[PDB]
């Protein structure tokens, strides 16, 4: 399996309008070697995908958001399952690839009484405490604290990419425009300017938050390049007996 083979079927995998879903497993199958993917607990917490695959012969752990189930929002079970997978993968020297498409967390009183703060902190800790090389691809959207949770740049990230369909923001456009310009009523002016200025990766690309905006059909090759350079990665951290994970 050549490392520089192209994936033209990924150019239009993400639908143009944001209310329609797509299968994230198709992207993973198209990217990994020979389209072979060992999936872990596939029938539990289907909101997220974790599994083992190979890139250029090297074993890689895969974490991805599933927009088909619950819109891809983070949860209790999703957080715990992803956290345990990431912890094993980082403990046994296995690189990580994550595919982010998430609007936030599931609302409701059941999640709030169940302690979703603790489990969200579990997933955030797992991503931030990892030392193996990790690569993130933003396909469509990453809103709010979910963007920081799901392997952001500022959590000691290594390589971060965005497809031309990616948009990164603190929240939805409508809510932002109705909590920024509230004193004076606006008709189609503020909404249009905010949409044409912030519904795109550029506010994150101008600040160096993403390395580059790449074409989808060239994703795999680029990943295969980054790992080839990142295998020599070593970091140092302050001495510590063991840490206090929010279990």
């Amino acid at each position: 399996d050549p490392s520089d083979r192209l994936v033209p079927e990924l150019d239009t995998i993400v639908p143009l309008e944001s209310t329609k879903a797509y299968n994230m497993v198709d992207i993973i199958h198209s990217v990994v070697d020979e389209r072979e993917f060992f999936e872990i607990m596939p029938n539990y917490a289907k909101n997220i995908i974790v599994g083992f695959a190979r890139m250029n012969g090297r074993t890689v752990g895969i974490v991805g958001n599933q927009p088909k189930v619950a819109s891809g929002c983070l949860d209790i079970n999703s957080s715990v399952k992803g956290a345990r997978f990431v912890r094993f993968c980082d403990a046994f020297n296995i690189p990580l690839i994550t595919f982010v498409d998430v609007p936030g967390f599931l609302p409701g009183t059941a999640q709030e009484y169940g302690g979703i703060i603790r489990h969200g902190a579990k997933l955030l800790y797992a991503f931030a405490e990892a030392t193996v090389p990790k690569v993130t691809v933003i396909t469509r959207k990453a809103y709010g604290g979910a963007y920081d949770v799901m392997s952001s740049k500022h959590l000691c990230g290594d390589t971060n990419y965005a497809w031309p369909t990616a948009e990164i923001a603190v929240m939805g456009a409508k809510g932002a425009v109705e909590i920024i310009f509230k004193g004076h009523e606006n008709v189609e002016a503020a909404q249009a300017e905010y949409i044409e200025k912030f519904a795109n990766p550029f506010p994150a690309a101008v600040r160096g938050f993403v390395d580059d905006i790449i074409q989808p059909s060239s994703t795999r090759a680029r990943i295969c390049c980054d790992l080839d350079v990142l295998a020599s990665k070593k970091v140092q951290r302050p001495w510590r007996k063991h840490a206090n994970i929010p279990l």
Partner: protein, 673 residues
């Protein structure tokens, strides 16, 4: 050709698919600006991207997307294009479109509306054919009120043929004509049936077309009175009155019959003052007596095969004669160059109902453009989506050679080397039809697939030698994967001791039998013993390539591996057909005997909502049919709409869902049978 000649500046193509791509390619060759139109769903199509300018027209449903007269006229006015090519289908034969477009001083690449209207109605077209001194069905067209009249017509116009009854057919007096007894029998039966329903006791005697063959003559004619015939085509292999394979030259008719058909078609085209291109369709019986069937005044789907025999380009010649330039080639210039065969590959299952359409998305798509004497006419690319609103056509393969056998061999090679993953296609049916016994000799009729397959398509029945070859290939592939699973990198801390296996003993479950295999490796050559039969398999054993070329003891085979599991299951596309096989070792073969058979229960006919939400709209109606993959209803939740697809086709017992209703998790929506 010389592009320096004064031609049009901009051409707008009013179609979609592969015909749009062909027209765009020809226009680009000619050095002309091209404008395309597309639906909203077709924003990323190939013809949209190749054309210089693309203008959206509207929604996805073609009933008011590609037939919007006003939108197309507005696009013409906006783009300032002075000519339009309608291709075939849609608005190519539309009087209203032509009359609306003639008002703005924009030329139409196609025949004048007089030809369209004179071919629209059957009675006046038949009268014109009578005027055009072209032979038709010699069938009687009068009245037969008694049996003696039937025998009189029988002895007057000849009686080898099936009977007709003017108003009424298919059992209404349909008798095989060899003697007067069936005259009387058909008379009484048809008279009784007419007195019941039809009312006309008259009878007719239309000459047979038993064992019919469909012959097409391609005619090209400018507006100065010059017309040319471009040889013939045979399109006799059909399912649901749709052709699947065509061949331009025909072994049925000799030179004199070909000349007679050409002269008659040219005379008919001249009679109507034809322009651009058209086709004349005859039916021929077993005695080489052609009978007129119709005249289609439009470019045909199976046109390019004739191109391969004559070297012409129909699109450029017709766009040239659209401006008024007389055609160049004379009648003596046209000739026959070799043989050509065309196969249409669709997106449909060839096993169930003989071509049920299917929808999906292309996981990966490759075509054999490097093979000799092969051209591909397609309008799809990898990642393309097969929609329910359009024709499920995928591509057409055209293969030319010096003679029929070379063309058929090259077509089989091309079919075996053609990758379509993501949807179901009909490659197996075409691949099996090409190597049919009576197709090769030339005994093709209109009822080919009807009587060759009384019980429907069942795949390719592989003989004992081919069965042994398939078993050997599968065993060698299993061992190749097992050997590749041993190659690690150097650790230098805990070295890997490579296991040594002299030979691999395998139990291979195929169809309903189990075979015993002994496989040995000597580098890149596998020695396989299948029930005492020795075979040698050699290949490069590139495990990542979609194609795999192996050489089983001399014979070269091309195979594809579609699926593979750790439990021993494989799916092998071999000779065009997909075979499911189970592979195990000895030890697992005896240890699997003690394993209790877990009974599996599946329904696949009850629809359950996985997440709570609100049903925006129901896209189905009770008492209909749904394809495997077609979405039934859409439910929105958290502002995202989720499409609930299907998994089978069945009868809807009841519908428990309505539009605008809020449903929870696990709620019952649709019950099938």
């Amino acid at each position: 050709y010389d592009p320096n000649e004064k031609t049009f500046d901009k051409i707008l193509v009013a179609n979609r698919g592969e015909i749009a791509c062909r027209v765009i390619r020809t226009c680009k060759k000619m050095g002309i600006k091209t404008v395309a139109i597309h639906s909203d769903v077709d924003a990323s199509s190939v013809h949209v991207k190749m054309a210089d300018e693309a203008v959206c027209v509207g929604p996805a449903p073609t009933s008011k997307s590609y037939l919007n007269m006003d939108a197309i006229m507005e696009a013409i006015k906006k783009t300032r294009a002075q000519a339009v090519h309608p291709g075939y289908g849609f608005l190519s034969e539309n009087k209203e479109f032509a009359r609306c477009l003639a008002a703005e001083d924009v030329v139409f690449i196609g025949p004048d509306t007089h030809a369209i209207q004179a071919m629209g109605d059957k009675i006046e077209s038949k009268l014109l054919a009578k005027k055009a001194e072209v032979n038709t069905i010699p069938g009687f067209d009068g009245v037969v009120k008694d049996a003696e009249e039937a025998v009189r017509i029988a002895r007057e116009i000849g009686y080898p043929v099936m009977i007709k009854a003017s108003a009424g057919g298919g059992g209404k007096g349909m008798r095989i004509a060899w003697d007067d007894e069936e005259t009387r029998d058909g008379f009484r039966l048809s008279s009784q049936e007419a007195a019941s329903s039809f009312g006309d006791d008259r009878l007719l005697i239309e000459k047979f077309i038993d064992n019919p063959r469909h012959i097409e003559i391609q005619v090209l004619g400018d507006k100065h009175g010059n017309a040319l015939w471009l040889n013939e085509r045979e399109c006799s292999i059909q399912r649901r009155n749709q052709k699947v394979v065509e061949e331009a030259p025909s072994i049925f008719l000799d030179a004199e019959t070909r000349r007679a058909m050409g002269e008659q078609a040219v005379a008919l085209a001249r009679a109507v003052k034809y322009s651009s291109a058209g086709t004349v369709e005859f039916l021929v019986d077993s005695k080489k007596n052609f009978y007129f069937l119709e005249m289609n005044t439009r470019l045909q789907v199976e046109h390019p095969v004739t191109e391969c025999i004559t070297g012409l380009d129909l699109v450029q010649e017709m766009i040239r004669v659209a401006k008024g330039y007389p055609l160049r080639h004379k009648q003596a210039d046209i000739r026959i160059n070799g043989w050509a065969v065309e196969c249409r590959v669709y997106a449909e299952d060839p096993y169930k109902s003989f071509g049920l359409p299917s929808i999906g998305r292309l996981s990966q798509y490759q075509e054999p453009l490097h093979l000799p004497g092969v051209r591909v006419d397609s309008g799809i690319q990898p990642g393309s989506d097969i929609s329910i609103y359009y024709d499920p056509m995928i591509s057409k393969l055209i293969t030319y050679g010096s003679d029929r056998t070379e063309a058929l061999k090259r077509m089989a090679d091309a079919l075996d080397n053609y990758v379509i993953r993501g949807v179901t296609h009909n490659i197996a049916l075409l691949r099996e039809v090409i190597i049919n016994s009576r197709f090769v000799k030339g005994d093709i009729s209109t009822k080919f697939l009807s009587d060759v397959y009384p019980d429907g398509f069942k795949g390719h029945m592989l003989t004992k030698s081919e069965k042994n070859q398939l078993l050997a290939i599968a065993s060698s592939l299993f061992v190749a994967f097992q050997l590749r699973a041993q190659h690690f990198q150097e650790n230098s801390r805990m070295p890997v001791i490579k296991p040594d296996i002299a030979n691999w003993e395998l139990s291979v479950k195929l169809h309903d039998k189990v075979h015993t295999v002994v496989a040995s490796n000597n580098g890149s050559v596998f020695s396989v013993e299948v029930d005492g039969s020795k075979l040698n398999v050699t290949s490069t054993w590139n495990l990542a390539s979609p194609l795999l070329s192996v050489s089983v003891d001399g014979t070269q085979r091309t195979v594809q591996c579609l699926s593979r599991e750790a439990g021993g299951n494989m799916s092998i596309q071999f000779l065009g057909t997909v075979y499911k096989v189970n592979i195990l070792t000895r030890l697992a073969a005896e240890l699997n005997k003690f394993m209790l058979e877990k009974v599996t229960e599946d329904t696949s006919s009850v629809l359950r909502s996985p997440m709570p939400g609100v049903v925006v709209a129901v896209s189905v109606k009770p008492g209909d049919a749904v394809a495997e993959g077609q979405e039934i209803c859409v439910i929105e939740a958290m502002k995202m709409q989720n499409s609930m697809t299907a998994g089978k086709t069945g009868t809807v017992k009841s519908v428990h869902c309505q539009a605008g209703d809020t449903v929870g998790e696990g709620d019952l929506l649709v019950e099938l049978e």
